[PDB]
Amino acid sequence: APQQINDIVHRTITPLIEQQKIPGMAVAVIYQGKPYYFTWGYADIAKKQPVTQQTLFELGSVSKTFTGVLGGDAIARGEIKLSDPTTKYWPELTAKQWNGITLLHLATYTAGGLPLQVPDEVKSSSDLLRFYQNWQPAWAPGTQRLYANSSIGLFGALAVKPSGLSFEQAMQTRVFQPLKLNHTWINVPPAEEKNYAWGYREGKAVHVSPGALDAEAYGVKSTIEDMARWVQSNLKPLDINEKTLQQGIQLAQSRYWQTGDMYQGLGWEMLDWPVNPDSIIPEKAITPPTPAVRASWVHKTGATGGFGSYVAFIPEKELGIVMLANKNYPNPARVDAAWQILNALQ
């Protein structure tokens, strides 16, 4: 790798690993449209199995970028419109509080205080319907953002419906396959388990628990190579041959909502570039949404019990980074490390 990349990556990530006691990490830097890979530590501590470029990590909430782009690919196809009411895709949602709640609201976390997590007791499809039917907004829809899995989880599940495909299959056939993300999974196959890192919560080896709407919100697993490829695809959508997927990516980076200095996209979140880490670490809709601004810090954090992940990229600079850890360390530390690297190479 270019020495200048080697230099900052090693000086930045290595101590980050020791401070946070991360068992294993993989990093990718996208520099002038090429990826460079870095690996440290262990995917499985007990078996002394090292992290490689083949290692699967849980992406957690970074999954939502796939979801957003898939939702975006659906808008481009004409299958859905953000303005569509929720009840158009789930007529069974008859309770009056859903009157006027739209896909936009769901996608942007502005439905009115949908909760952080779908409650644990929700297991069946009828549990899920009962949960949303009995939920009462904490404030008016369309007025105030509260980040929520039960919000973007629902959006992704609804956005696939016109297509007739399950969310898992829309995701695989419209997003994963056309971008050759051949080692990116919602469900890891038996033969890939040897590549699936263990996550580490309080010293014990864990893996993400099944939960309702887990696929849509936090359940993707991927390798550093595929995630680098995911960043290349979002950095340069124009290289993508499939037109709806090209527009889908672009729409995901539109700005639909501003809160403080942050802009809500579909999955992706954004800040005007340049910004300093402190600001990465006034509340209103943007109508119509601002088309994607190339001078942006486009990013997303992700966590599960045993994993911490981060992706960020600046389109203007054709620059990006992916950091995948099998331990869930604090988000500020991720944004500090990444900004240091991208800023050094800017």
**To 10 degrees, the CA torsion angle through 308, 176, 53, 49?**
70
Cβ proximity of 276 and 346 under 8 Å: no
* CA neighbours closer than 13 Å in the CB half-sphere of residue 111: 30
Structural gaps in the chain: residues followed by a C–N separation over 2.5 Å: 281
Q: Domain extents for the chain?
A: 1-346
The Cα–Cα gap between 197 and 227 comes to 15
User: H/E/C letters for each residue in 311-323?
Assistant: EEEEHHHCEEEEE
User: H/E/C letters for each residue in 25-79?
Assistant: EEEEEEECCEEEEEEEEEEECCCCEECCCCCEEECHHHHHHHHHHHHHHHHHCCC
Question: Is 124 one of the annotated active-site residues of the chain?
Answer: no
Q: In the CATH hierarchy, which top-level class contains the domain 1-346?
A: alpha beta
Extract the tokens encoding 2. Answer: 């270019």
The Cα–Cα gap between 165 and 157 comes to 10
Cβ proximity of 65 and 252 under 8 Å: yes
Extract the annotated binding site.
61, 117, 147, 149, 303, 328
Q: How many residues are listed for the chain in this entry?
A: 346
- Whole-angstrom Cα Rg for the chain: 19
Q: Which of 61, 233, 254, 296 is catalytic?
A: 61
Considering only the C-alpha atoms of the chain, give the largest distance between any 2 of them, rounded to a whole number of Å.
Answer: 61
The Cα–Cα gap between 247 and 289 comes to 14
Extract the tokens encoding 253. Answer: 């980076």
The Cα–Cα gap between 119 and 53 comes to 35
**To 10 degrees, the CA torsion angle through 44, 50, 51, 57?**
-10
The Cα–Cα gap between 93 and 24 comes to 44
Extract the annotated binding site for a beta-lactam.
61, 117, 147, 149, 303, 328
Extract the tokens encoding 297. Answer: 């810090």
* Number of C-beta neighbours around residue 147 at 10 A: 14
Q: Is 320 left (phi over 0), alpha (psi -120 to 50) or beta?
A: beta
Cβ proximity of 289 and 268 under 8 Å: no
* CA neighbours closer than 13 Å in the CB half-sphere of residue 53: 10
User: H/E/C letters for each residue in the chain?
Assistant: CCHHHHHHHHHHHHHHHHHHCCCEEEEEEEECCEEEEEEEEEEECCCCEECCCCCEEECHHHHHHHHHHHHHHHHHCCCCCCCCEHHHCCCCCCCHHHCCCEHHHHHHCCCCCCCCCCCCCCCCHHHHHHHHHHCCCCCCCCCCCCCCHHHHHHHHHHHCCCCCCCHHHHHHHHHHCCCCCCCCECCCCHHHHHHECCEEECCEEECCCCCCCHHHHCCCEECHHHHHHHHHHHHCHHHCCCHHHHHHHHHHCCEEEEECCEEECCCCEEEECCCCHHHHCCEEEEEEEECCCCCEEEEEEEEECCEEEEEEEEHHHCEEEEEEECCCCCHHHHHHHHHHHHHHHC
Cβ proximity of 56 and 196 under 8 Å: yes
List beta partners, residue 26: 39, 324
**To 10 degrees, the CA torsion angle through 220, 221, 227, 230?**
-30
Cβ proximity of 146 and 109 under 8 Å: yes
Residue 161: phi, psi to the nearest 5? -70, -50
- The dihedral of CA 258, 254, 67, 89: what is its sign? positive
Specify the resolution in Å: 2.6
The Cα–Cα gap between 197 and 199 comes to 6
The Cα–Cα gap between 158 and 152 comes to 10
Find all residues with CB under 8 Å of 16, minimum gap 6, and list them. 22, 333, 337
Extract the tokens encoding 12. Answer: 């930045």
